């Protein structure tokens, strides 16, 4: 065996130039697609908020047109999915993990146009869903599409091009190349067996799509929080406790998303019309809340800098929290096309902040600033629910550029994954794939 090992070492890191070049082309396409998607969404939210001025007089007519618009967009989305590609429903990440396990097809000819225009409807309609799902899935399918277009053979090419397209998608959703690479090598990849995935190719693809992102989003940030304060050693324990809180809440939140997934399937029993209409109702409800109390709807990115700065009151924080737990559950569980990463970033921020506030009044001698707890908690829900701490920590880092909070962030995120395990719970994406795969049997 030692002779085989020696042979492999001596042959390590030699990826066929063709796969690398195709990873470059994939990265470029995924990046362009993610830019186009983001712009379309923004344009829709804009138009919608522009109609509210052409009808800004009759208040009831306002609360009416907000709802109608959002309903029509949500409905268009649910329709496009339920009618053409059922698989493009929800996050899309589980499905792609399945494809990495060769247990789920990659019908790109269907998913690409459906996930794109479908998500455009739901996101542009104001629903509490992120761009992460749609872009990562479109990424993967783009990778499959190029694989098929150049009829590339071998597991590696199939596995590599699929994984890079996914990573570049994540990169282009958050402008976070490192988070995009780490996500594949911590969550997406098969967790129980070896794989022929070329990291360097993933790298190339991510770089390419991130550059495509920069070509269209120069001089702006998704989340500008500025430079926060430092964290003394004697304050570290506070970040542990907060992790324990996320730890008890992580599993619970997972139970709810899955439960609500079932409970809502009952309401329409799988009927495409009761489905499309239920979605139209949730969507419209979001467009409605998107005016009355904006902090309860949308992606949540907007309310992050504010909450971190301490501009919200405790009561406002609790309100926003509960309302968002409800709208997030309602939107994701309903099978609507969208991600759950950002909503969880928002929730984590709010919870983290509230905790910081409490801490501040309880420990004046620590000279705390609630925002450090907001940043530490921002990725804590991704650590407790999806259970991919390293990717969350690096994503937050890449978005908030507050590396001096690195230790607290790791301490908080680790506490969450430690407490989430000893309270049971499962990696939400894994639980979902395990669910699709279980429902695929017992149905034979």
């Amino acid at each position, epitope marked *: 065996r030692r002779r085989q090992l020696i042979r492999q070492l001596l042959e390590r890191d030699k990826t066929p130039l063709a796969i690398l070049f195709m990873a470059a082309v994939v990265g470029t396409l995924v990046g362009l697609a993610a830019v186009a998607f983001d712009k379309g969404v923004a344009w829709l939210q804009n138009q919608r908020m522009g109609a509210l001025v052409h009808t800004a007089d009759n208040y009831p007519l306002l609360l009416t047109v907000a709802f109608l618009c959002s309903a029509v967009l949500a409905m268009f989305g649910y329709f496009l999915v339920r009618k053409y590609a059922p698989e493009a429903g929800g996050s899309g990440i589980p499905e792609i993990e399945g494809a990495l396990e060769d247990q789920r097809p990659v019908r790109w000819w269907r998913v690409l146009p459906v996930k794109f225009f479908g998500g455009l409807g739901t996101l542009g309609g104001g629903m509490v869903l992120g761009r992460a799902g749609p872009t990562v899935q479109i990424g993967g399918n783009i990778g499959r599409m190029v694989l098929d277009i150049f009829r590339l053979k071998g597991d590696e090419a199939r596995h590599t091009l699929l994984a890079t397209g996914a990573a570049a998608g994540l990169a282009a959703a958050f402008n976070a190349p490192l988070a995009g690479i780490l996500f594949i090598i911590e969550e997406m990849r098969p967790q129980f067996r070896y794989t022929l995935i070329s990291i360097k190719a993933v790298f190339i693809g991510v770089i390419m799509s991130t550059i495509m992102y920069r070509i269209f989003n120069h001089e702006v940030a998704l989340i500008d929080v500025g430079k926060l304060s430092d964290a003394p*050693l004697n304050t570290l324990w506070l970040y542990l406790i907060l992790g324990i809180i996320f730890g008890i809440f992580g599993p619970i939140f997972n139970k709810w998303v899955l439960g609500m997934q079932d409970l809502l399937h009952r309401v329409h029993g799988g009927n495409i019309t009761k489905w499309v209409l239920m979605g139209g109702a949730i969507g419209g409800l979001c467009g409605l809340l998107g005016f009355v109390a904006p902090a309860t709807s949308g992606g949540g990115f907007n309310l992050i800098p504010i909450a971190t700065a301490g501009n919200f009151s405790m009561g406002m924080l609790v309100f926003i929290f509960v309302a968002r737990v409800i709208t997030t559950l309602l939107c994701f569980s309903s099978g609507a096309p969208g991600g759950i990463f950002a909503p969880m970033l928002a929730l984590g921020t709010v919870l983290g902040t509230a905790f910081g506030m409490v801490a501040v009044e309880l420990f004046p*001698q*620590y*000279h705390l*600033e609630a925002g450090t707890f907001a940043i530490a908690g921002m990725g804590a829900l991704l650590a407790a629910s999806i259970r991919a701490p390293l990717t969350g920590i690096i994503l937050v880092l890449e978005m908030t550029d507050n590396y001096q909070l690195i230790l607290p962030m790791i301490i908080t995120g680790l506490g969450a994954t430690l407490l989430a395990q000893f309270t049971g719970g499962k990696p939400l994406y894994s639980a979902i794939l395990a669910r699709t795969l279980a429902k695929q049997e017992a149905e034979q």
Partner: antibody
Amino acid sequence: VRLLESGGGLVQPGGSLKLSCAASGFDYSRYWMSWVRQAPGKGLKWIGEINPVSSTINYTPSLKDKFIISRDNAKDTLYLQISKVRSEDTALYYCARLYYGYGYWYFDVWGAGTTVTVSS
Amino acid sequence: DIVLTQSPAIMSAAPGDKVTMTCSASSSVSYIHWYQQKSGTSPKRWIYDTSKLTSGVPVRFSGSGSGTSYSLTINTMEAEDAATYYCQQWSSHPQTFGGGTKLEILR
């Protein structure tokens, strides 16, 4: 690193005066500033502290607007307004930059201080 | 708020001698600090976190203690050690200071 506080002097009882503290030789912004005073022949006594963005300002257990601590990061200057001055307020006033080791904060660097005299 | 009482208000010691001053706390404290104040001049952070020396403080200077009793010590005292030493604790809010200890050069 220098802390030069001025404004002190003779003030009539019940009157009010504003002490200033000019900071130089370091980034004034990432630092918490604090005021402390020493009455003639007596011990030291903390007056209060103020964080970088002025979002937090704490005082000694002394009532209401008796003390108003402010700061101007644009001029790297710290301010302390005292009102209804009485004899107990006659003392040497020191501004101090705050910092910490393990986290149990200390008074990093002190200034030469300004003398305040309350008399008619 | 915590009351720090320094055991010796005034003490005299000839150069070259182990001098030790106490800082008792009314309650429990941790990682106390020490400041040196020479007549006519501003206080200088000398020892912090109970035993760490500030950059520039001679090795003859040491500090120790725990729970509710701390102490500053000077091994083979010099002539430039004469000053007033104040202990301070921010382990509890608001911070407080000791009554101070006056170190005079016996001769």
